């Protein structure tokens, strides 16, 4: 057969997955999925027969119920959402390769026919709140109007829920936690403002840091109420002490605050709709929202009523050619991001009349794997873990801003570097046990034989860690003035990863105020649109702390919900 409908038809009827008039039920195609379900089992249940040793296409790291129609589509070949930042060895019946390339929203301009039309008809839903985007800032924007009274419809353009927060692997600041305090750590909402404003290079929006600060224990504290483990914390780069929470034990923050927020959110009966996009903002004769227009992938375009509209569909890093000519020296880059995040959302904005502002700035995570074309968090080196070149130097203060990293790393010999670390190191921060699982972090018992391994200078590695060591145990880091120096690397066996910086976040973008609402270029407010997470401009200037975006995204998300209930 040469698609997996013709395949089923074989032996079976068209209702075998169909209803019964043979209308797809919506763009969420819940019915049909329900109907591979019945016969193939969960995707727990599928996976138990796929496995491979190290991976399983079946199940993943993603959070949340990933409906089978992700992958397989039924009338025509269809691509496996994996192979957008990975290439495992897969043989999924009736696959084409990977290849994402959605339509802008100008280019959507040219739909005017099907528009127009569904402009003019009554609108599907009324509602109170329209939420666009499924990841931190959309899903606590979802449920905060929710429990505030607001009736919410929330919409996601991928197949997937979580965006890229459901890829978050070093923590979320906060201070002065409880978690903080049951760890013997002392910190305060005011040192973490004077930490993010510095680190920004003072361009931050001071009022909006002041909420990103003060807001930020409650926002763990809402998140842990929730259901949350946020009660290992961890240091990142660029703050004066250990502020990033995470999961027991060091596991990936994004992962299970997003399953929370799932859970909590169907807990809610949350209305959610998978593969639709919002396109326009609509606005009445008084310049106030009246609705936004969407596009169903498989139901098409449709309108929906509503008082607000609150934008967290995310930032750009993953279309290169808008970051390339904001930034030119990230040209060419590999990015960090999931497919969808191209900055469609930003558009949106913009065509609703808001401004944007800080768009140059635009960060770099420092290591990604090089083997691997993934991320790799900084608490592995927030944990202890250095960095050398291929001639088995140090050659920067592993845990400074990540503008000074990436430059660092980029200026050494062959424009990459590798992390080292050991045992001590790997038990404890468990996300590093998923880098050894990915196959990117070749190991050894001793540091001769990994530098020869790996083509850095093994005699040069052995005295570099030696004296690393040195510096751990005398308490200070004369070398490149590293100020916290958290483990020696000195039990059982020693790893390596290649990395070299990749586009990661954008810190500009749609101008808010304190309460989240969208402004024009006269600083004006435009009533009823919202923006909050990774597509606002103004929290995190000119470079972005570690762990600032899943504190900003639950912060401004959940603010953003309750001040639009309000509005109503
Ligand atoms: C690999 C990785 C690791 C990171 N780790 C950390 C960490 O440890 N700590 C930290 O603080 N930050 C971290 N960051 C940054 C942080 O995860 C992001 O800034 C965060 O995802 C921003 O969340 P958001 O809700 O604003 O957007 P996202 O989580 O990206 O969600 C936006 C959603 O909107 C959808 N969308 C976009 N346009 C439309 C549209 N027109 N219609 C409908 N849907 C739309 C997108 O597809 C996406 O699902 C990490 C980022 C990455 C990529
Ligand atoms: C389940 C294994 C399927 C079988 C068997 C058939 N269809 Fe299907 N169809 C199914 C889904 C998941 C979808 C979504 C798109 C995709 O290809 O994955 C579709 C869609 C259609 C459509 C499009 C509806 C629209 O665009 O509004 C039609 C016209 C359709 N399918 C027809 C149809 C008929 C007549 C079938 C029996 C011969 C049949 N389908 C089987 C999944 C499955
Ligand atoms: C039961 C009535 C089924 C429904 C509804 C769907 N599938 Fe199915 N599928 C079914 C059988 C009996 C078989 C053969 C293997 C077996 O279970 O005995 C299959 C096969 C497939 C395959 C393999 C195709 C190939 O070329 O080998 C896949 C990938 C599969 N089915 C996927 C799938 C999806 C995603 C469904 C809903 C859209 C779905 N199936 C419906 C039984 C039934
Ligand atoms: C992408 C993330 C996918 C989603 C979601 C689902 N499937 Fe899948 N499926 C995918 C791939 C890459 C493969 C190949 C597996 C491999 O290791 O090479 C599969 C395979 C199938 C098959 C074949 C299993 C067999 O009998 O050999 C089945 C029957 C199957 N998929 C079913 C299925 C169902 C019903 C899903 C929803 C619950 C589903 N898959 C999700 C990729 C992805
Ligand atoms: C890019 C946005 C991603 C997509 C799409 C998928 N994965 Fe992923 N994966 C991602 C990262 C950044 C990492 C590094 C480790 C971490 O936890 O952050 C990974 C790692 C894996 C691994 C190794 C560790 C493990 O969980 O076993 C596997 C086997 C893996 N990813 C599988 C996987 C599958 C099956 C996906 C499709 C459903 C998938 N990933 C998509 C980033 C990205
Ligand atoms: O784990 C990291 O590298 C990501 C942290 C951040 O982007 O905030
Ligand atoms: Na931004």
């Given at each position: 057969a040469?698609?997996?409908?013709?395949f089923?038809?074989?032996?079976?009827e068209?209702?075998?997955?169909?209803?019964?008039?043979?209308?797809?039920?919506?763009?969420?195609?819940?019915?049909?999925?329900?109907?591979?379900?019945?016969?193939?089992?969960?995707?727990?249940?599928?996976?138990?027969?796929?496995?491979?040793?190290?991976?399983?296409?079946?199940?993943?790291?993603?959070?949340?119920?990933?409906?089978?129609?992700?992958?397989?589509?039924?009338?025509?070949?269809?691509?496996?959402?994996?192979?957008?930042?990975?290439?495992?060895?897969?043989?999924m019946?009736?696959?084409?390769?990977?290849?994402?390339?959605?339509?802008?929203?100008?280019?959507?301009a040219?739909?005017?026919?099907?528009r127009?039309?569904?402009?003019?008809?009554?609108?599907?839903?009324?509602?109170?709140?329209?939420?666009?985007?499924?990841?931190?800032?959309?899903?606590?924007?979802?449920?905060?109007?929710?429990d505030?009274?607001?009736?919410?419809?929330?919409?996601?353009?991928?197949?997937?829920?979580?965006?890229?927060?459901?890829?978050?692997?070093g923590?979320m600041?906060?201070?002065?936690t409880?978690?903080?305090?049951?760890?013997?750590?002392?910190?305060?909402?005011?040192?973490?403002?004077?930490?993010?404003?510095?680190?920004?290079?003072?361009?931050?929006?001071?009022?909006?840091?002041?909420?990103?600060?003060?807001?930020?224990?409650?926002?763990?504290?809402?998140?842990?109420?929730?259901?949350?483990?946020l009660?290992?914390?961890?240091?990142?780069g660029?703050?004066?002490?250990?502020?990033?929470?995470?999961p027991?034990?060091?596991?990936?923050?994004?992962?299970?605050?997003?399953?929370?927020?799932?859970?909590?959110?169907?807990k809610?009966?949350?209305?959610?709709?998978?593969?639709?996009?919002?396109?326009?903002?609509?606005?009445?004769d008084?310049?106030?929202?009246?609705?936004?227009?969407?596009?169903?992938?498989?139901?098409?375009?449709?309108?929906?009523?509503?008082?607000?509209?609150?934008?967290?569909?995310?930032?750009?890093?993953?279309?290169?050619?808008?970051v390339?000519?904001?930034?030119?020296?990230?040209?060419?880059?590999?990015?960090?991001?999931?497919?969808?995040?191209?900055?469609?959302?930003?558009?949106?904005?913009?065509?609703?009349?808001?401004?944007?502002?800080?768009?140059?700035?635009?960060?770099?995570?420092?290591?990604?794997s090089?083997?691997?074309?993934?991320?790799?968090?900084?608490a592995?080196?927030?944990?202890?873990?250095?960095?050398?070149?291929?001639?088995?130097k140090?050659?920067?203060?592993?845990?400074?801003?990540r503008?000074?990293?990436?430059?660092?790393?980029?200026?050494?010999?062959?424009?990459?570097?590798?992390?080292?670390?050991?045992?001590?190191?790997?038990?404890?921060?468990?996300?590093?046990?998923?880098?050894?699982?990915?196959?990117?972090?070749?190991?050894?018992?001793?540091?001769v034989?990994?530098?020869?391994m790996?083509?850095?200078?093994?005699?040069?590695?052995?005295?570099?860690?030696?004296?690393?060591?040195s510096?751990?145990?005398?308490?200070?880091d004369?070398?490149?003035?590293?100020?916290?120096?958290?483990?020696?690397?000195?039990?059982?066996?020693?790893?390596?990863?290649?990395?070299?910086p990749?586009?990661?976040?954008?810190?500009?973008?749609?101008?808010?105020?304190?309460?989240?609402?969208?402004?024009?270029?006269?600083?004006?407010?435009?009533?009823?649109?919202?923006?909050?997470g990774?597509?606002?401009?103004?929290?995190?200037?000119?470079?972005?702390?570690?762990g600032?975006?899943?504190?900003?995204?639950?912060?401004?998300?959940?603010?953003?919900?309750?001040?639009?209930?309000?509005?109503?």
């Amino acid at each position: 057969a040469d698609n997996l409908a013709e395949f089923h038809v074989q032996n079976q009827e068209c209702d075998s997955c169909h209803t019964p008039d043979g209308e797809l039920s919506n763009d969420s195609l819940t019915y049909e999925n329900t109907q591979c379900v019945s016969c193939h089992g969960t995707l727990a249940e599928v996976a138990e027969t796929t496995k491979h040793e190290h991976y399983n296409a079946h199940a993943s790291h993603f959070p949340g119920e990933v409906a089978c129609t992700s992958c397989h589509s039924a009338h025509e070949k269809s691509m496996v959402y994996c192979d957008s930042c990975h290439s495992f060895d897969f043989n999924m019946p009736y696959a084409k390769k990977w290849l994402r390339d959605e339509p802008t929203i100008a280019e959507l301009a040219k739909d005017k026919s099907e528009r127009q039309a569904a402009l003019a008809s009554a609108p599907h839903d009324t509602v109170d709140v329209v939420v666009v985007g499924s990841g931190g800032a959309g899903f606590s924007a979802a449920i905060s109007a929710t429990d505030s009274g607001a009736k919410v419809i929330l919409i996601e353009k991928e197949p997937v829920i979580g965006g890229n927060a459901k890829l978050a692997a070093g923590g979320m600041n906060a201070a002065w936690t409880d978690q903080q305090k049951a760890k013997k750590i002392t910190d305060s909402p005011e040192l973490m403002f004077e930490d993010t404003m510095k680190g920004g290079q003072n361009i931050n929006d001071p009022a909006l840091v002041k909420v990103l600060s003060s807001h930020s224990k409650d926002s763990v504290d809402w998140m842990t109420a929730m259901g949350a483990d946020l009660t290992d914390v961890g240091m990142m780069g660029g703050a004066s002490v250990n502020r990033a929470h995470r999961p027991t034990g060091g596991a990936g923050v994004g992962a299970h605050v997003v399953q929370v927020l799932y859970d909590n959110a169907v807990k809610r009966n949350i209305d959610l709709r998978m593969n639709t996009r919002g396109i326009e903002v609509l606005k009445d004769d008084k310049g106030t929202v009246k609705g936004i227009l969407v596009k169903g992938m498989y139901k098409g375009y449709y309108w929906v009523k509503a008082d607000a509209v609150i934008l967290a569909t995310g930032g750009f890093a993953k279309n290169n050619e808008r970051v390339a000519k904001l930034d030119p020296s990230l040209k060419g880059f590999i990015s960090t991001n999931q497919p969808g995040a191209v900055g469609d959302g930003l558009d949106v904005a913009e065509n609703a009349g808001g401004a944007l502002k800080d768009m140059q700035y635009i960060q770099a995570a420092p290591t990604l794997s090089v083997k691997g074309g993934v991320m790799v968090t900084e608490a592995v080196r927030g944990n202890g873990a250095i960095l050398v070149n291929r001639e088995g130097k140090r050659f920067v203060n592993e845990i400074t801003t990540r503008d000074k990293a990436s430059a660092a790393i980029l200026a050494q010999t062959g424009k990459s570097a590798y992390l080292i670390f050991d045992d001590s190191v790997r038990k404890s921060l468990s996300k590093i046990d998923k880098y050894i699982g990915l196959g990117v972090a070749p190991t050894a018992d001793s540091l001769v034989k990994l530098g020869k391994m790996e083509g850095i200078d093994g005699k040069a590695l052995t005295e570099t860690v030696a004296r690393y060591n040195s510096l751990v145990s005398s308490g200070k880091d004369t070398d490149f003035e590293r100020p916290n120096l958290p483990r020696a690397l000195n039990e059982g066996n020693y790893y390596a990863i290649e990395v070299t910086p990749g586009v990661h976040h954008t810190m500009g973008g749609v101008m808010i105020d304190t309460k989240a609402e969208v402004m024009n270029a006269k600083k004006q407010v435009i009533p009823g649109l919202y923006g909050a997470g990774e597509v606002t401009g103004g929290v995190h200037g000119a470079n972005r702390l570690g762990g600032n975006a899943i504190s900003d995204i639950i912060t401004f998300g959940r603010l953003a919900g309750e001040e639009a209930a309000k509005y109503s």
